[PDB]
Amino acid sequence: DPKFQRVALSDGHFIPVLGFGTYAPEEVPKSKAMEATKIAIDAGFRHIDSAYFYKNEKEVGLAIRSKIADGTVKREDIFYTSKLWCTFHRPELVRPSLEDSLKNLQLDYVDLYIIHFPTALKPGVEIIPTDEHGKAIFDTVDICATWEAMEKCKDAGLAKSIGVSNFNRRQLEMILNKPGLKYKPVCNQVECHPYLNQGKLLEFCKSKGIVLVAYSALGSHREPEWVDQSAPVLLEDPLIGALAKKHQQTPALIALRYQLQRGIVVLAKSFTEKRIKENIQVFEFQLPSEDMKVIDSLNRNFRYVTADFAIGHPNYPFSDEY
Ligand SMILES: NC(=O)c1ccc[n+]([C@@H]2O[C@H](COP(=O)([O-])OP(=O)(O)OC[C@H]3O[C@@H](n4cnc5c(N)ncnc54)[C@H](OP(=O)(O)O)[C@@H]3O)[C@@H](O)[C@H]2O)c1
Numbered sequence: 001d002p003k004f005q006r007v008a009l010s011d012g013h014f015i016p017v018l019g020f021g022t023y024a025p026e027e028v029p030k031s032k033a034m035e036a037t038k039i040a041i042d043a044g045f046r047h048i049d050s051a052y053f054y055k056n057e058k059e060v061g062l063a064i065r066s067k068i069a070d071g072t073v074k075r076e077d078i079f080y081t082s083k084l085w086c087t088f089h090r091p092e093l094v095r096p097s098l099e100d101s102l103k104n105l106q107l108d109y110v111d112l113y114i115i116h117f118p119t120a121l122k123p124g125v126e127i128i129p130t131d132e133h134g135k136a137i138f139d140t141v142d143i144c145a146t147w148e149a150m151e152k153c154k155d156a157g158l159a160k161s162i163g164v165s166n167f168n169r170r171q172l173e174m175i176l177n178k179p180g181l182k183y184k185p186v187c188n189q190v191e192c193h194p195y196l197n198q199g200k201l202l203e204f205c206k207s208k209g210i211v212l213v214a215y216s217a218l219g220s221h222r223e224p225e226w227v228d229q230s231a232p233v234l235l236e237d238p239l240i241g242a243l244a245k246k247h248q249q250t251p252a253l254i255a256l257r258y259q260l261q262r263g264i265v266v267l268a269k270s271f272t273e274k275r276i277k278e279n280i281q282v283f284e285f286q287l288p289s290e291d292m293k294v295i296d297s298l299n300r301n302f303r304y305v306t307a308d309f310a311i312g313h314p315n316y317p318f319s320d321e322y
């Protein structure tokens with residue numbers, strides 16, 4: 001059943017090539033993630049993407065633990081991802097964060113734990129702490145030291161795999177190039193879609209054996225307001241439409257299947273039963289090379305997530321060409 005297909009990770013673990021995305025806008029109750037994750041699992045999703053940041057880990061864990069108690073899946077059929085938030089980059093905060101997430105999940109490990117952004121922020125009770133205004137408070141933590149703390153999470157059997165998110169090439173190289181590296185990041189999970197296809201990052205990751213995992217592959221939720229206001233809308237792109245018509249597909253399906261054909265692992269968030277069943281048909285067709293080269297033309301280097309809160313940070317990722 002091709003919908004259960006996985007790509008090899010450099011550490012000998014396997015990751016489903018399509019993942020269920022669980023972030024929703026703050027106004028959306030975390031229970032929807034719960035209801036949506038159950039439905040996604042029934043549909044055949046096995047790879048579930050979350051993060052400390054989405055504050056839905058107790059909800060997703062109930063879902064996953066629901067799907068296990070009724071025979072649907074075994075723990076080892078599920079591939080759960082979570083992410084170290086930037087307020088815990090400090091080595092001594094890394095395990096307790098992940099154990100915190102396990103305690104919430106009521107699971108024994110996560111299959112992938114990754115650094116969410118390379119930009120550390122000031123620890124404490126705010127998720128993104130900001131001053132007497134706007135601006136996040138940066139903290140200065142060496143990414144390699146965060147990395148070592150993550151390697152120790154792997155060694156502890158807490159996370160089967162470890163990786164990063166939103167790193168540029170320079171920042172991957174820093175980890176790669178770490179004197180004494182035990183484990184390489186198995187993936188770099190980054191925004192990826194026809195408007196920001198990531199063709200130089202992707203080539204780089206591959207040459208290094210790192211899996212690129214794409215988020216906002218369907219065009220993001222387009223928040224807040226100002227982005228929704230002027231960002232092009234992926235799923236309505238007239239050329240992605242032409243392509244869906246030609247293959248009798250939907251826009252979403254074209255955009256998902258574009259990523260898979262580049263050996264990207266692609267995430268897809270829907271809390272809509274029907275679009276959940278739809279997204280998993282991505283495996284029911286292919287695009288010829290000539291269609292991939294026409295989608296290539298849509299690239300404009302536009303970002304749905306500039307993560308503005310880390311502008312002026314030492315390690316803000318998006319300044320370099322890639
Ligand atoms: N590493 C990171 O910093 C980071 C950042 C962003 C996202 N992510 C991960 O990536 C996942 C997905 O990315 P995302 O949140 O940017 O959203 P996305 O997958 O790009 O798309 C989300 C939007 O597309 C809609 N949609 C889903 N399927 C559809 C379908 N087949 N047809 C038409 N519309 C459809 C969803 O609507 P409905 O839900 O209403 O169906 C939702 O509004 C997230 O859930 C999160 O797990 C990680």
Ligand SMILES: C[C@]12CC[C@H]3[C@@H](CCC4=CC(=O)CC[C@@]43C)[C@@H]1CC[C@@H]2O
Pocket residue numbers: 023051053223224305307308309
């Ligand atoms: C940009 C933002 C902070 C960063 C958030 C973003 C939406 C959800 C989100 C999911 C992630 O996985 C990374 C952080 C982000 C991208 C938030 C919406 C408005 C808020 O300012």
